[PDB]
Design a protein around this ligand. Structure first.
Ligand SMILES: Cc1cc2nc3c(=O)[nH]c(=O)nc-3n(C[C@H](O)[C@H](O)[C@H](O)COP(=O)(O)O)c2cc1C
Length: 138
């Protein structure tokens, strides 16, 4: 499988690693890819797109890299399964609620409740691993 994410300080990156750990513990392989190194054509071949990005500016997706990436794949993902995640700091998940609505509007099937964790996982480390296990169980 594949996990594509953007992280500014490493919080979402840590979530990605843990989600990957859950998928692997379930017996499957998974590649963690920073959005800057992603290959769209290779990504679109996947049965499930696992996408992550922290809350930026005022409850939006990161603007310089992640946002453009979502825009580029937006017209080629209708009917595709996607799982969303990300770390946030002071809000309560607005950027993620919007991200979910957005992907749905592109015709994607959001397979699980998006995983959001405040700051670095820490106590939520197991929640990240379990999210990965749910995705692997699809
Ligand atoms: C410029 C900037 C704007 C932010 N905007 C939001 C926001 O609107 N809502 C929120 O809850 N957190 C916001 N945050 C906090 C980050 O989402 C949070 O620190 C998260 O843990 C960072 O994850 P990362 O290391 O993966 O980027 C913002 C952080 C920065 C640097």
């Amino acid at each position: 499988m594949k996990i594509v994410y953007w992280s500014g300080t490493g919080n979402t990156e840590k979530m990605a690693e843990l989600i990957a750990k859950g998928i692997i513990e379930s017996g499957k392989d998974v590649n963690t890819i920073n959005v800057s190194d992603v290959n769209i054509d290779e990504l679109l071949n996947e049965d499930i797109l696992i996408l992550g990005c922290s809350a930026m500016t005022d409850e939006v997706l990161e603007e310089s890299e992640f946002e453009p990436f979502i825009e580029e794949i937006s017209t080629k993902i209708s009917g595709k399964k996607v799982a969303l995640f990300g770390s946030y700091g002071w809000g309560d998940g607005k950027w993620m609620r919007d991200f979910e609505e957005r992907m749905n509007g592109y015709g994607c099937v959001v397979v699980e409740t998006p995983l959001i964790v405040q700051n670095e996982p820490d106590e939520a480390e197991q929640d990240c691993i379990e999210f990965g296990k749910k995705i692997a169980n699809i």
